[PDB]
Each structure stands twice: as structure tokens, then as C-alpha cells.
Amino acid sequence: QVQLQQPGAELVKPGASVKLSCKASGYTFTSDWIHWVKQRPGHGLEWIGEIIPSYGRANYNEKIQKKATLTADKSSSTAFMQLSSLTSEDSAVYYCARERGDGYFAVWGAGTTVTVSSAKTTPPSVYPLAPGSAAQTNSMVTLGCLVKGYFPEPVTVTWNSGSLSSGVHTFPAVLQSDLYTLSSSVTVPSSSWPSETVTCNVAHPASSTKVDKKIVPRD
Amino acid sequence: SALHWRAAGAATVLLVIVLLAGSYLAVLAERGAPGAQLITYPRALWWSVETATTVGYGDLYPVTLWGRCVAVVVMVAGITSFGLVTAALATWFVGREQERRGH
């Protein structure tokens, strides 16, 4: 089972502060340290700091401006990182990880995408993408779904609740006028559709929303 | 069982505890200090043994105040422990020799 659970995203207005969480499960030892690693888009991993829950002491990277403060709740097995007075430079994915006191990160959280912006949250609009009536099908058929008008990142797109993974392409979002837009592609044997249903599931953590859209042939 | 044998036993059990707490404590104090190498439990335990034995490889040692404090405790605990065993042994021989002399 998922050892470290982190919120998908957090939207923060410039100057404000946010408290990220990391709920842990599985074996817990007094020697466990919880780490936090920052990763800006397209860039590498940057260590932020650590904390040992059994004692409550934390250490921080000295090379960078201290934006965080770590704390931990033993009863709830949850570690918290308070990031304060953020700017656009603080926008990135923040992972938490577990180290058994032996120097390596055995497991990582899924990370929390933090976006520092004044813009407002906006759930995405999901539209189907079915072939036109004049489109000739081969031994396979390509469908997909358009996800636009959302903010902030990210959005997770799955096919048939995840049962469909092979032949799936989800394109990187593009930003235009404070809103993101992306499409996901799925290819299945031409024979299996529409006989066998195909639906794309789009979850948007920032708005706490998750919608489904069945892909059926055009009228 | 005679005192000296019980004490020795005690000292050993006590030493093992000090080795363990020492290891833990050492890591706790050392993390956060730039360039510290005494920062993971396993080697910390090896560090505590060599410290208790006053062996001296120098492959590892503390650089923070509390780390060093913890260190002093382990050294003392170790030397005292090993010295107590010696006393115990001396007491054993002394008693036997007395016998061998008819006393």
C-alpha cells in the first residue's frame, strides 16, 4: 500500500503561505527521517530539509533561502512542511520521502504541485474526440479527449478507470490566457470500438473534481 | 554469584545500552552540521564500538558539541566497563591464590 500520501496540488497567491502534508503508513521506526525535495519543471531534484518524527528535530539546506519549516504529528503519522511568503520561484513539485536512517530514500510520495499565482482556480472542460464520418479505419482506431480551460496544473487523465494503459498518450499542457489545455490519445483495435466502451477519466486536484466522458462515434 | 562477577555483567549490559543510545544520539546531534560523516545509524554503531574500545581508526568522529559530548560518555562508559572487568579478574585471582596458600 502507498507508504506516503501527498495532496495533488496547492494554489498559492504571491506572498501567502501554505502547509503541505505527508501521511505515512507501513512500518514506522524511531530512526525514520522524513525528507522534502523540491523539483522545478524541467529541472533536477533539490533537497530542502529533513525531520525525525520520534524526536521532532529538523535540518534544512543551508545553500538556499529558507522558505520551509518542518513539523510532525506522531499520533497521525503525518509530516508537514510550511512554505511561507512564496513567489513564482517557489512554484514546483514538492516530494516527501522516507529514509530509514541509512542514507537512501527508500520510498517517495507522489509529490504535490505548488503553483504561486494570483489567478483563480478553474475546473477543466472535457470534450470527446471521435473520428469524422469520412475517416478510414485501419486495424486500430485512435480516439481521445480534449481538456481545456483549467487552472492550475495538473490534471490526471486515465482510460477506463485505468484498466486501459497501452496505447495512451497524454500531451503536455499549454498555457494561454491564464488557462491550461491538453489532449490525451488512446488507440485500441478498431473492432473493439464502439462495442467495448472507452471512457477518459479526468481528475483536477486543485478543484477537487473528477469527470468522465464516454467516447462514442459521431451521430 | 559474587559481586565482582555481577558488576562486570552489569557493566556489559550497561555498555551495550550506552553503545545503542550513543549511536542514535550521535546521529541526532551530527545531522545539520556541514561536513559531518557521523550521520547514519549503522556506521554510528560502528563508531560507538571503536569509540568504546578506544581503538582509533579515525575513519569517523563527531564535529558538533553535543556529538562530542555523547562521545565522551561512550569513551568513559567503555573504559570504566573494561576496567571493571579487569578488577573482577584481579579479584578472582586474588581469592584463588589465597586458597592455594591455605588461607
Place this chain on the structure above:
Amino acid sequence: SALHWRAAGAATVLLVIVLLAGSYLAVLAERGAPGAQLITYPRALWWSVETATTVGYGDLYPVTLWGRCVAVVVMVAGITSFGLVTAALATWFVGREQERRGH
């Protein structure tokens, strides 16, 4: 209080003084020698402890003649001190064992 316990106590108090004077003295002798690292009081005190315990990290040591002289004194003082405690302990066990034998 018996002699051996008083002596041990004494040796400890004496050791602590030697550690302190040693630290001070060590800095005094070491400054001025190019490349010396035994040149500030705080680490000098840490240097004196490890010296007294014959621990051996090697993270620090003297390079001047007087520094080394001071060093020899701290080593001796330390070994003698710790050896005296052992004797004291041996004397304690010996006395008790005699009792346990009715003498």
C-alpha cells in the same frame, strides 16, 4: 571514606585541572607554528579529552615541541587517572570477597 575512593576522587579533580591547563597551554605553544590546528581553546579542550582517553581520532594533534610536551603530560595524567580508578575498583571487590568468605 577509604583511601582508594579518596584517591580516585582526587585523580579526577586533578585530571580536570590538567585538561584545562592543557588546553590553554596547548594553544599557547601551538600558535606561531605554520600549519598548526591546535590553535583555539574550544577544540583544544576537545583535543585534551581525546588525548586523556587515548581515543585516537587524529582529527587534531600538536606539532611543536612544547605542544607535544603538554600532550605527554595529559596522556600520562589520563592513563594514571583511569588506572587509579581500576585499582580502586579492584580494592573494593577484594574487600567484599574477603567478607563473603567470612574473613
Place this chain on the structure above:
Amino acid sequence: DILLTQSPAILSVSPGERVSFSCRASQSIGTDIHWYQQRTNGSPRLLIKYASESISGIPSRFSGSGSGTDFTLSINSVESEDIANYYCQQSNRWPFTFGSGTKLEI
């Protein structure tokens, strides 16, 4: 602090070919080097610990070597699923640090 240098930043290999990633430490760190894999949009995943120790669940295709200041992560017969970013991380001295990463391209 210990600087971990991972060069080249990008490595191009033909399918089924053996590939080697390099990680150099600014100072001798024994074998306290660890490797992680990070695919697109995924989190980092431990591949090798203490330079050459295998991790259960990881293909026998992955192996590590090196000690001191030069370390190497190797993949025998590369395959598509291997396309990702690779980082090295040291735990020899505080604070822990990461390499700048290397991207495997087929």
C-alpha cells in the same frame, strides 16, 4: 558540501545496447552513492543503493559500480521502459546532495 557531477546530461543509445551513466563526487565518499530513476511525470525510484547494491523489484539489467569519487550506473541491453532521467545522491556527509541528472535517449 559535496558536489555530484553527472555528465553527459544526455545519453543516446541504440536498442539492446549497454549504457553507462557517470557520477563524480567532489571528494571521496566511499560507496555511499545511490541511484534513482525518474520517468516523465513520475516520482523518483531507487535503483541502486550504496553504489552497487541491488534493490528487490529492479530488473537484473541494472547494476552499479565505483567507489571513492567516480561511480557508474549501468544498464545491459537498454529497452524503451528505460527511457527516463537518472540521478545520483550521496549520503557520505551532511547534507545529502543530488546529481544534476542524466537523460537516457534511445
Place this chain on the structure above:
Amino acid sequence: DILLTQSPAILSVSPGERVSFSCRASQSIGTDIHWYQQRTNGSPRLLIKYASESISGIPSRFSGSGSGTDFTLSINSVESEDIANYYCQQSNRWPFTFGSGTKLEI
């Protein structure tokens, strides 16, 4: 003797911007590095001791990091009063030595 190298000799920054001074030691000196500030016609003033220890009376804007041979003095959001010369000084081995200095320019 330990040589402390401070380069660049001049650092130009825009107001409110973060700035970093560099001091490299010819040999590993732990964290026995200390920073001083010297404004025009003034005497040197201790800013940071033992690489990263804060000094009472000094703005939280100043911070230091580094250990071994590479050290860094940082200023968050620079401001006019920060215009001066900055020196590093080692106390790891005898005799103590100073960096050649770095001038902050806004």
C-alpha cells in the same frame, strides 16, 4: 599557509535581488571560515562566524553556508546599506588569513 580566494572581485546586483559571495580555501578547513563587512572609511564588522553562525545585531538578510573548501555568503534582497567590501577569514590553521575581498555594487 591557507590561501582564501574571493572571486569575482566585484559583484553587480539589482535592488532587492539575492546575492552570493564566494570564498574558496586552498585546503579543507571545515567550517572555520568567518565573514566581515567593511563599508567606505569604516572598520571591518563580523557578519557570520564559523561559516553559518548568525551574529546578534546583524540583519536576518545575511546568511552563510559551505564547509570544506567552498564557502558562500548570501544576502536576501540587497539594499543600499549593503554596499561595501566583503572579506572571508580562516582560523582553521595558523596563521589566520583573509580573503582578497569582494565589492558589492548595486
